[PDB]
Design a protein around this motif. Structure first.
Motif, PDB file in Angstrom:
ATOM      1  N   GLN A  31      -7.444 -13.495 -61.102  1.00 45.03           N
ATOM      2  CA  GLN A  31      -8.642 -12.684 -61.284  1.00 45.03           C
ATOM      3  C   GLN A  31      -8.745 -11.640 -60.173  1.00 45.03           C
ATOM      4  OE1 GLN A  31     -12.245 -14.982 -61.861  1.00 45.03           O
ATOM      5  NE2 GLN A  31     -11.207 -16.485 -63.174  1.00 45.03           N
ATOM      6  N   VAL A  32      -8.446 -12.054 -58.943  1.00 44.04           N
ATOM      7  CA  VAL A  32      -8.466 -11.145 -57.800  1.00 44.04           C
ATOM      8  C   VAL A  32      -7.429 -10.034 -57.942  1.00 44.04           C
ATOM      9  CG1 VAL A  32      -8.119 -10.928 -55.313  1.00 44.04           C
ATOM     10  CG2 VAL A  32      -9.323 -12.909 -56.245  1.00 44.04           C
ATOM     11  N   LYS A  33      -6.201 -10.411 -58.291  1.00 47.00           N
ATOM     12  CA  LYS A  33      -5.122  -9.442 -58.470  1.00 47.00           C
ATOM     13  C   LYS A  33      -5.490  -8.403 -59.524  1.00 47.00           C
ATOM     14  CE  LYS A  33      -1.564  -9.626 -56.848  1.00 47.00           C
ATOM     15  NZ  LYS A  33      -1.015  -8.989 -55.619  1.00 47.00           N
ATOM     16  N   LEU A  34      -6.037  -8.875 -60.637  1.00 42.11           N
ATOM     17  CA  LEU A  34      -6.533  -8.000 -61.690  1.00 42.11           C
ATOM     18  C   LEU A  34      -7.600  -7.044 -61.156  1.00 42.11           C
ATOM     19  CD1 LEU A  34      -6.981  -7.025 -64.586  1.00 42.11           C
ATOM     20  CD2 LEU A  34      -8.384  -9.058 -64.982  1.00 42.11           C
ATOM     21  N   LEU A  35      -8.573  -7.587 -60.432  1.00 46.43           N
ATOM     22  CA  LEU A  35      -9.652  -6.771 -59.881  1.00 46.43           C
ATOM     23  C   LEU A  35      -9.121  -5.675 -58.964  1.00 46.43           C
ATOM     24  CD1 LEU A  35     -12.699  -6.217 -59.511  1.00 46.43           C
ATOM     25  CD2 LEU A  35     -12.649  -7.831 -57.604  1.00 46.43           C
ATOM     26  N   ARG A  36      -8.186  -6.028 -58.085  1.00 48.08           N
ATOM     27  CA  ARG A  36      -7.587  -5.055 -57.173  1.00 48.08           C
ATOM     28  C   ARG A  36      -6.930  -3.902 -57.928  1.00 48.08           C
ATOM     29  NH1 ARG A  36     -10.519  -6.314 -53.031  1.00 48.08           N
ATOM     30  NH2 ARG A  36     -10.193  -8.452 -52.259  1.00 48.08           N
TER      31      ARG A  36
ATOM     32  N   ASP B 105     -17.591 -10.439 -59.215  1.00 47.07           N
ATOM     33  CA  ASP B 105     -17.195  -9.044 -59.079  1.00 47.07           C
ATOM     34  C   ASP B 105     -16.312  -8.599 -60.239  1.00 47.07           C
ATOM     35  OD1 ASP B 105     -14.965 -10.536 -58.343  1.00 47.07           O
ATOM     36  OD2 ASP B 105     -14.989  -9.884 -56.252  1.00 47.07           O
ATOM     37  N   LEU B 106     -15.412  -9.472 -60.677  1.00 40.59           N
ATOM     38  CA  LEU B 106     -14.566  -9.160 -61.822  1.00 40.59           C
ATOM     39  C   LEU B 106     -15.399  -9.041 -63.094  1.00 40.59           C
ATOM     40  CD1 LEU B 106     -11.887  -8.607 -63.067  1.00 40.59           C
ATOM     41  CD2 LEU B 106     -11.516 -11.073 -63.339  1.00 40.59           C
TER      42      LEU B 106
END
Length: 238
Positions: free
Chosen positions: A99-104, A146-147
């Motif tokens: 999810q973090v990688k996607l958001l970045r 955040d995502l």
């Protein structure tokens, strides 16, 4: 068509030709990918790119990086959807780290292939989909806030088969059968048996439209290979 579908296709008409993220809600087999492909087709810019569908729940952890970001050689999902539409189904199935990688990527608008030293700029329309209550998952800590807040801007709900009703069910069924048997040949056959369409109307379809299309396909095959409506072979299908 049902009132629910007309309202949805109306929403599609309203929000298709802009660069805003879309979040689709609906049960499995309801037609979320098809709706996403419609959003793709209707966008004046992104239509010229590829449609890249992803099932986020069917990705082993060891392959996430390669499948999304690629290798310095493999082209990942993000780079595949450059100038097109990225369809992320089962988005709630993403682990927190992914999810973090996607958001970045959504935030930085760039992708670093595994083995590279230079990031590559990417621009795609994002359509995510889920059959879960994402806000509940956020409250539960299973999905990043955040995502979600970046994803859940344009939201469309796609109604199940049961919500669409018997009128829509039969029209879909007959449409699918015609495409399998052929409308010319269908005209040379006896009428579609009343008990059959009535069965479809009174049947519940957990697998929704996909399941209905499977039934229609099996019906059509029976028809094509027997040159008529074999009541026995058809009855076995219900």
């Amino acid at each position: 068509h049902s009132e629910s579908m007309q309202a949805l296709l109306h929403e599609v008409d309203t929000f298709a030709d802009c660069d805003t993220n879309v979040l689709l809600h609906g049960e499995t087999g309801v037609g979320k990918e098809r709706i996403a492909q419609l959003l793709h087709e209707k966008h004046s810019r992104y239509r010229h790119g590829e449609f890249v569908p992803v099932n986020c729940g069917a990705i082993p952890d060891g392959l996430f990086e390669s499948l999304f970001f690629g290798h310095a050689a493999h082209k990942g999902y993000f780079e595949q959807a450059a100038g097109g539409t990225l369809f992320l189904d089962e988005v709630g199935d993403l682990p927190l780290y992914q999810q973090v990688k996607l958001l970045r990527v959504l935030e930085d608008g760039a992708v670093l292939r595994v083995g590279a030293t230079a990031p590559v700029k990417v621009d795609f329309r994002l359509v995510a989909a889920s059959n879960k209550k994402l806000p509940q998952l956020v409250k539960e800590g299973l999905f990043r806030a955040d995502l979600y807040y970046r994803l859940a801007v344009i939201e469309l709900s796609i109604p199940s088969l049961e919500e669409r009703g018997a009128v829509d069910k039969i029209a879909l069924f007959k449409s699918f059968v015609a495409q399998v048997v052929g409308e010319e040949r269908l005209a040379e056959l006896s009428d579609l048996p009343y008990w059959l369409t009535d069965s479809v109307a009174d049947s519940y379809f957990p697998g929704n439209v996909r399941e209905l299309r499977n039934l229609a396909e099996r019906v059509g095959v029976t028809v094509r290979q027997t040159g008529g409506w074999d009541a026995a072979r058809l009855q076995r299908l219900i």
